[PDB]
Every structure is written in structure tokens, then in C-alpha cells.
């Protein structure tokens, strides 16, 4: 013939969607939890760190958090191998725009480039698809702070707060309740992340080494980028733990007060 | 399914592919040609089966030329042989002009050998199903006879033969002299061999075809038709009738 | 054809969400002769075993450690031909890029290039990825060193690691014995012991290949030098 | 399972399938008479919130050749763009008139490109699913050709193609005559067109056109169609 | 796994198809052997024919790759001949470009890389051949390198070819303890002897084809009958 | 396997009506058996 | 089974080494019209049947003026034939520009063949399924060739394509000797008779289907069309 090797891939069926697209989603779900809380002050970003050992080393704080701009950073959910290829093109387009326009690229435009790549493959290309989701922590000087999300299905959103990674449904629900429309500050947010993070974690002990946290705020330049240190993170956790203990204690006092069972 | 008729760019549990064995079966399935080399030159002779009277030959034969010093004969499918050959003469010609020499027989072979082996490594282009017999007389080297197989194998020969008859012909040939008299004498002798071979093939008529590269031809490639073909025929008709 | 063939890859998404070919390569890795690495902090030690299986050999002919650069070296577990080829392309890329500049090579960048070549082959069909795992060993200044590269296309930092046959068992031995401050001579003693424990068919001064990165990067040990250490503690 | 296949029958698969697709479309009718060619069509309708005013399927290629098309309608939109240009190119080059037939050949070359094999140079994977009734007037007078999805052209004087074609062609025979009046014809055409229908006979689902030498290619207007209804 | 129209990674650890190249690499009955000394490096082969309607003065399985380098091939004939042609071009080019002589080893390594790519293609197979390179270097002395078409090549103290390699290996090891005690010709004699035991044929003047590489010469030459018979006679005297 | 070839030659002699064999019968006999074989 | 296998490989080879593709191609020639070819070798004639699909149609031509000294009849589908014909006309045009010679039709036919044969020898190309009887009046006289989509090139003194080719062949062999190197008139009569043999023979002779085309010593390409054959009837 001239082609007959194929397994009849990357085609439609009575499914009415695409099999391969669907498959990817489950792999996203596996990978460590990442959380974005967006507030009227700053942007809080937290991600939960996977396997760490004592033979393993820390060469950066950056191991889930990657800087795409001097006002953009992302959390990537997906296999490492694919992601590094993808990341480089994304960094590169901002630099084009920077060259011509002579000021930073809009956040929305940078998100638009990623979906365009993927879609081409699904119409026809000859190269298998991929699957990566980014959570965007970003800022602007005429539209204020931005948080976005991207999915490989070509659906991106904007959020006040969203979480993706393991136990996505439960985390989203809790997140919806503790939240208040506006009226949010960083300090409130520090607690909010951990509270939700602990409930998704199975390991009963929480420690500063299982988490990475960062905030992007403004003051100077366009922003100040803060990478939070392990002692500071540990301090937030202990303070927070003492608050969970404290809540529980008040509740027990109320139960005794009603009449004990 | 054997899983390797499909390929022709891979190995099998038999090593080479089934497709390549098959090409070897198809030459044997064809008619019958022989060749005899001597110290004065080399003779080619081939049997052609007659179909019906409507037909006539005028560009389709089984004896083919290479260049204008090279003689070419084949077993297998006609159309494909002609396709190999037109290119060979052309490749030979660019050489001939470029290096300024009148190509060897040996160099020509190498060039063809390489083409066929390349087609065995891929599944893009199905192989030829021919076997080609070539040779001549070189002014300072002698006579040399080669045969190239579709099996990616080629050698220098004293005699070679192909066709259904192959085994049997080589036996008779094997019986005869190394020198084998003079070339002229061989023209008669080859005709007996074909003459006798036809009793074994006989279901319909044949036409006897002979060719030569002779000391008298001065190393050029020519057909032997004319009275010369007919005398050799008379001598066979006298000796036996078979 | 000459441009036809399989445009998409052999590897394919599964309803498992695993990559079949990738899974097989961990097996491909598994078959390798015993490898270890110890980072002596100021130094680096990499070691492996040359199995031997035909008495008929010459010299110490081919290695299993080749210098990419004068500062970084590779050793591996997986398939040998793949290794030779992998070294050639990289070796070409390392020299060309770092003679444009006169700066000496950063470690991470080599890793980024090896992983991409591995990854493009995952992206494209017709050709299959390599089924080797590498230990990128170097030295430079006060930087961290000793890195591992997967046939997967992933990288990680380590202080110590092991490859080859029974990789999990050796690593468990390694984990316990390897702690705190050690010496470059000391790290060699340990690595031989860890390799012996994995398997000894024998050890001679030609079953062992040890190389270090310390003074001015990569230096190749003499056969006598290693033998002195074998006596120093068998 | 190639579609680059010749087929064991040696009768290509894809061409045969096309005829079926055609049996699903409407009915289009042509009678060419002694002087003039008439083409009549069903452009149909279905709902009341639809505007078939918008729709058409009989087009004028030029003011002296026309065509009616039938089948997978989107393909015919591609088909015409190529033809229309090619005709126009001949006017740049010699400023002269093309024959109905020359135009029909040019488009048939383009009918063979299906495959990515080596019998056809690729661009398409499959052919155009449409037949066309090509009409014109020139010095060879009014003529009609039937463009066959089999990438071939046959000449005709009367033809129906469509779902109803098997019946229609039979019906077409009795009414046809080598000499018959043009106006008379239009009434005869109307009768066959009536017979096939299940839906109402209105001037808002059927369309007539003719070409006559005395007035060029003319599309027939609503007011005109309504009058034709009155007569029969 | 699926060998059917593609070749992939398998839990097999090898490939059925790679094994099949190893297995049938001869379809005749030739066997070969090569030994290395510091006085010579010799390859001993056979000459055999099926009939005598065939010539034997052009039939050979020993190739002169270049003046210094010699190559004996064990492999399918079509594949052996192709590879030679490819090599001949690559060597020549290496001479042109570098201006210096091509090392034996260098060729084996270069060729090996060409084999390897074909192992990655599932649109093309590797050529089926084992190539033994022999030569006289001035940079380590004589060198004997065998390749296999897996991409594997290595240099050996001596090696053997044909289908009975392992059997020849056993003689070889016995011998290989002492081999620097053989002078020139006595190398040759032993070399004849180990093929005659395996193959179980006391040779004849037109059945054998000894090729020798000679130290202090850049010659690769196939030996004349008088010398070949002188040896053959020499083993009779010890029987 | 060789024995059959010998006897095979012997059939052809009975056909020829001689108790007298030739080299040719053996050459042909051997080839006849070889083909028939695995 | 494996019918689909043998379609899927155009590189096909079977245990019996057959190539099915050629086989398919032959069935397609037999599906076409009826055509005969005849030559005296000083005149050549071809009676060709041109048929019509239905009553209200009129017959489609199968006699093509390739050149003003060479020509063909087609037998098989019309669409492929057009494509081949452009290549051959242009090959005649450069012969005229460059060389200013007609060029042997024998030499021409052989060249066309190769270019087709080589794509069967690799991926792609389906059979073209038209056979031809190619006539032309060259330097050594007229000559007749049969081109097949198996690229089987043969010169014959007469031939036929169309279902029940064999029938007419047997008559051609019988009358063969009568043909000699004369008479225009006689060749056509035998053709009209012969053509009857190719048909089922329940269909009676008609002047609208038949078409007669001649080339000869001082003749070039001429067609007798419809009624025009009645004078010579």
C-alpha cells in the first residue's frame, strides 16, 4: 500500500469526542495538589510536594513553581518530560512580544498560544497529543491581579480561587465555603490554604518540607516575587495547627455546655 | 498470516523474506536460456515458445544488448527486464564518456548488484523477478561471463543456464570440454542442446535463437541468424529427431 | 516511501494512563551490569563493573565511562550501542555550544539537551527512544554535582544512587551505610563494598572501573591506584 | 483497506457509492428542444421559517453556458469556482467564446485527483459526488450534456437525474419529440415535476430557466412561474 | 510483541528478529578462523564449489578493503558485498578529509553507528553480517576486531567464524596460553590445525584459503600454493 | 537417505533395459531426492 | 481468502508468485467495447463500435486522433485515457520541434511503457484498465501494436479487444491469408463480419454504432462517422 502500519489512531467514533483526550485527564488527577487563591491584596500560590528523600537534594525552591515572566509564574501538573519542552516555547513568545511592543505581554494572550498548539494536533498533524494544565499567578497594571487556569481540552478559565490535583472535587467545595466575595487579605489566605490542604493530605503529619508556598504581591517594579522560606512556612503551619486545636477545644466546651451526652 | 509478505524491510524466522524466495521461483517458471563461454569469446542461445501466427516480434525478444559491446539475455518477466536494462546502458554510458574507457563487464555487474540489494532492505519497491546473463569479450582481459540473480548473488561462470530445464542442461554442459574447440563449433553444439531440450518442453512449437560475441565479431555484440543458424539446425535434425 | 512510515509513535496513551514502551525500558535498564555513584562533596565517585564473559578480549578496549568534556563524564546502565551513539551526539553539542562562548559548561544545560533528544523520539515515530539511564557526573567550583537522567526524559538530583541488576536491593544497602562526611579515598572503599554486595562474580583490577571528578574535574584512575584501595580494605 | 484500491472487480468502489448519494437528492430535469435548452429544477422547501429565496441550485456558468447540479451540494460549490474561472481565462487569451463541451472536459480532468497513490496526483482523497447537466448554445446550436460523476461526459437531448430518475426517464420518453415547441416543452416538464412531488406546487420550491439565442441566458422570475402554473 | 510490521521494546530483552540474524548468517558450510600473533594475524578460510561450470578465480570471500586493512566477511552474500562498497567509500573519504591513515578500529566504530540507527528504524532492517577486521597498526601493532550487527564490536585475542564457533573456541583457549612462543610460520601451522580438527577435514591444496597480515609490511596477501603446501606437509611430519 | 538414491538409479536402468549403469543416473537421482525433501 | 490482502499490496507476490493486480486489470479490458485491428501492411483499418447508454443519447467516441499519422482506439474507461493522450501528444510535439521527425511509433510506444511500469514496481498506482489498439503509418509502413495496462507491448498483424475477442481472432486467422497486401474494400467487409462475432450476435448490424477509420500509403488520419460508412458498405 503505502501506509497500513497504523492502529487507526487519533480518529473519532460514536463517542463523539476523542478517546485519547479523555485519557489524559486521569493522569492529571494523580499528580500533587496545587492551589491558587486570588485575593484583593496579592495572589497566594501553594503546591504540595511529592516524593522527597534524604538521598534526594534541593537545588532550588523552584521544582513545581516556574517563572514564565517577571510577573508570571505557573504551577504545572503533568509528567516532567513533556512539560519542559512546552514551557520553553511559552517563555519564548513573551520575548517576541517584548521585542515589538516594548512592554509586557498580556496574560490572556500568553494563555491563547498554548490552546492553539494543541487544537492543531487534534484536527490533524501526525504527532500524538499531550496533556498539561497550568495554574497562572499573574498581575497587570490596568487590570490588576490575574489568576487563570489552562487544561489541555482547550478550556481555560479564570478564578477567584481554584485547586486542581488530587481530590479536586472535595477541595473545590470547601474552598467555595470558606471564601467570601471580596474582603480577603493575605493573612486570611495563609490560613485558608493550609486548612484545605490538610484535609486532602492522608499523611496525618504536616510539615514545611511537603509544601511549597509563595505569594506574588506588588509594592515595587511591577511586583515583588516572594518564595517562602522553610522556617516561615513551618511557622504558619504551627500557628494554624494551634488554631485547629483551639477550634476543637471551643466546640467541646459548647457540647459540654448544651448538656454532655 | 505469516506476517512478512507484508514486509520486505525486515528479518523473518527464515532470515530473508518469503517474497524474495518467490521471486526465485518465478524465473524458473519462465522458458529456458543457456550461455557458453569460451577462450575465443562467448555464445548465448535462448529458446522462445511460439504463441500463434498473428503475432510477430519486432521489439520484444529475450536477447537484449547493453551499450555497443555488451550482450544481455534474461529469464523472467519481459517488461521489468527491459526497465532494468535501459537504465544500465545509460549508467554505463555516463561512465564510458566520463572515465573515457569502455566499461568492464565486472564493473557493470557491481553497479546492478548494489541496486537489487538496496530494494531488499526496503518495502517501498518490490523487486524484479528476472535473472540477467551478461558478458562479452574484452580486448585484453578475455571472455567473462556473469549471471546476476534476483537473490542478490552474482558470480563469474564457465556456463550458466536458467529456466525450467536448468539442472538438466548444466549436466550436459558439464560433460563437455573446457576449451570447447572454437566458437563456431559451439554454435552447432548449443543448437543440439536446445534441440534436445525441447522434447522435454514440447507442447507447441519453438523458435531457436542464437547470438554471439566472437573473435570474428571483434568483441562487438551481434545476433546469429541467417544461413549460419540454419546449418547448426540441419546438424541437429540429422543426429536425432527429438 | 522515503518519507512514509509511521508518523505517530509506537508508544501510546493507555486507558491505564501509562506508557507501555516506557515501562519496558525500566526492564531494559534492569539488565545492566552493577553501577553506583557516591558524591564525596569535594569529589565525586562513580563506579561500575565490567562483567567479562570471553577470555578473548584485548587491552581494556571499550569503556563504559567516556568523557563528554573535560569537566563532565557519563556512566550508565542500559544498552551499550545506545550509549556510544548517545555520547557522540551530545559530545558534539557540548563542544559546539561552549566554544561559541568561552565560559565553561553548566551541568543542568547538558541534562536539558540529553533529555530533549530522548523526548523528541517519544514525540515522533518511526524511531524508538533509547533505553539507557545515565549518571551525569562532574565537578565545577562549589556547585552541587551528581545527577541522574532517565530513559523517561526526567532528571533528579542525588547524593547517592545505584543501577543495574537488583537496583532496589543495592540502594537499600546504600541508604544505610552512606551518611555524613567522607573522603574521596573513603568513598571509593564504600562503592567497591556496595558493588561487591550487589554481586561479585569476582573483582580484579579489570572488573572494576572507577572514575572521579575532583581536582580540575574528571580524572581517570590508574589500574594500580584502585588496586591499592582493594588491599586498603577488601 | 485502501481506497487507493482498483478493486478485484476492477470497478472502483467510490464511484459506485456516489450514485447512491445522488438518489438521495432532488430531481432535476432537462429537455433541449430544436431551439432552446430548458432546465427545470426542484430547489425544495420543508419548513415555514426557512427562506429558500436564498437557495438555488441552478446557476449560470456564463451567459451562454449554464449548469444545473445534483448531489452533495457543498462539492458542487468547489466545482463551479474552478470552471468559471477557466472559461474566463479563454476570454483573456483569445477574447472568444468557449464550447459547452470544452468547458465540460476541463472540469472532468479535475475530477481525477482522488487518492494519494500514483495513479492520481493527490490534493483530494475522494471525488466530487455530483452529476451536472451542462447546457449551452453556440454555432453547434443548443446542446445538452450529462456530466457523469464517473468523470466522463455523455451527450444528451433529454435527461432526468434525481431520486425519481428511473420513473422520470420513462415519463420523459413519451413526451419527448425530436421537434416540439419550446413553450410546449415547458408545460411537458411541469407535468413530470408535478408527478414526483408530495409537497405543494408553488413557485417557491421549483425553478425554471431556459436559454434562447434571442435573449441570452435567462432565469425565470416568480411572476413568470405563476403564469406557467395557470396554463396546465 | 509485534514483529509483524514493527519492532518494539519487549520484556524479551532482545528481539526475535536480532536473534534470527545471529542464527542463520551462513547458508552454506564454510567455516572461518582468525588468530592474532605479534608476528602475523591470520585468517584461514575455505574454497569450495558445487560444480565446475563456475569459475573460482574470482570467487573469493576474502576482501582487500584497502592496502593496510583486510576484511573477511561472514554473512549473506548480498549483504556482505553491499557493506564493502559502503565501507570503501567511507574510508577513502576519511583519508581525504583528515589526510592521515584511517585506523582499523576507527572504521569498526563508525560502521557500528550505521548499524545502530537501522536498529531504531521500524522502516528498515540492519544488514545481516559479521565483519572481522584485521590489520597491522603501527600504533599498537596488529589489530583484530570483530563486529556483529547488533552494533557490538570488540577486539579479541583470536576468534572464529562459521556455525561451529564455540567448538573452535575450546581449541583456541588451550592454544592462547602460549602463542607468543610461535614464530612466523608456526603461527600459520597451528592456525591451519584448529580449523582441520573442528571441521574434520585434512585439507587439500584447493580447499583452503589462508590470508595473512604481516608485521613490518603493510601487506595483506593471500598465500601461494607452495607456501600453503609447505605448512600442510609440516603437520604430517608431527603426526 | 543415500540408499534410496542408489535404488533410484537402479529403477532408471530397468527402464533403459540394461544391467549397466552410468554416472548420469546418480547425478539425476540425487537431485530428485533433494527436491522432494524438507 | 486474503483477497483484501492482495488488494492492499501493490507489491504483492503469492506462493504461485501471481500478481492479482494484473488479473483485475485484464477483467477491466473485457468490460469495454468491441474493437478490431487489421492491417494488410500497406493499409490498416480498424472497425470500432461506439455505443450509447440510452435511447435519448448519441454514441461516445472511442477513436482518438492522436496525430496526423498515428492513432488509436480505446477499449475501457474514458477518464484515464484522456490523461495518457496528453502525454503522448506532447511527446510528438517536442519530436517535431527539436528533431523535426515523426519518430517511429514503435520507439514511441516502448518509452511510454516504462514510465507506467515503474510505479507498479513501487507504492501507489492502481491499474489504468484501458487496453489500446494503436495504429500508425511509419517509415517502414504501417505497424500495429497492442498496449495493455500490463504494459504488454506486442506488434501483431491484427488483433481484437472486447468480450468475445477470441471468436473474431479465429476468423482473422482463417481469413488471414486472404488479406494480402491489397484491397481497401475487402479489409472492411471482413471487419464488419468479424465485428459481429465479438458481439453477442443477437444485436443486428447498425450504421449509427459502427465507425471505420483508415490510414494507409498516402492516407493519414480519417474517420468515417455514422452514415458515412454506408458508401463503403
CSV table of C-alpha atoms in Angstrom, one decimal, chain A residues 4, chain B residues 1-8 10-22, chain E residues 1-6 16-17 20, chain G residues 2 5-6 9 13-15:
chain,number,residue,atom,x,y,z
A,4,UNK,CA,-1.2,0.4,6.8
B,1,UNK,CA,-0.8,-14.8,8.1
B,2,UNK,CA,2.9,-15.2,8.1
B,3,UNK,CA,3.4,-11.5,8.9
B,4,UNK,CA,6.2,-11.0,6.4
B,5,UNK,CA,4.7,-10.9,2.9
B,6,UNK,CA,3.5,-7.6,4.2
B,7,UNK,CA,7.1,-6.6,4.9
B,8,UNK,CA,10.1,-6.6,2.7
B,10,UNK,CA,12.7,-6.8,7.9
B,11,UNK,CA,14.1,-10.2,9.1
B,12,UNK,CA,12.0,-13.5,9.4
B,13,UNK,CA,12.4,-16.9,11.1
B,14,UNK,CA,13.7,-18.0,7.7
B,15,UNK,CA,16.0,-15.0,7.6
B,16,UNK,CA,15.3,-13.4,4.3
B,17,UNK,CA,11.7,-12.8,3.3
B,18,UNK,CA,9.2,-15.1,1.6
B,19,UNK,CA,8.8,-12.5,-1.1
B,20,UNK,CA,12.4,-12.9,-2.1
B,21,UNK,CA,12.1,-16.7,-2.3
B,22,UNK,CA,9.1,-16.3,-4.6
E,1,UNK,CA,5.5,-8.4,20.7
E,2,UNK,CA,4.5,-7.2,17.4
E,3,UNK,CA,7.3,-8.2,15.0
E,4,UNK,CA,4.8,-8.3,12.3
E,5,UNK,CA,5.4,-4.9,10.7
E,6,UNK,CA,7.3,-3.1,13.5
E,16,UNK,CA,13.4,-12.3,18.0
E,17,UNK,CA,14.5,-10.7,14.7
E,20,UNK,CA,17.4,-14.7,13.8
G,2,UNK,CA,-6.8,-13.0,1.6
G,5,UNK,CA,-4.6,-8.6,1.4
G,6,UNK,CA,-3.7,-8.8,-2.4
G,9,UNK,CA,-0.4,-4.9,-1.5
G,13,UNK,CA,3.7,-11.9,-4.5
G,14,UNK,CA,1.9,-15.1,-3.8
G,15,UNK,CA,3.2,-18.8,-3.4
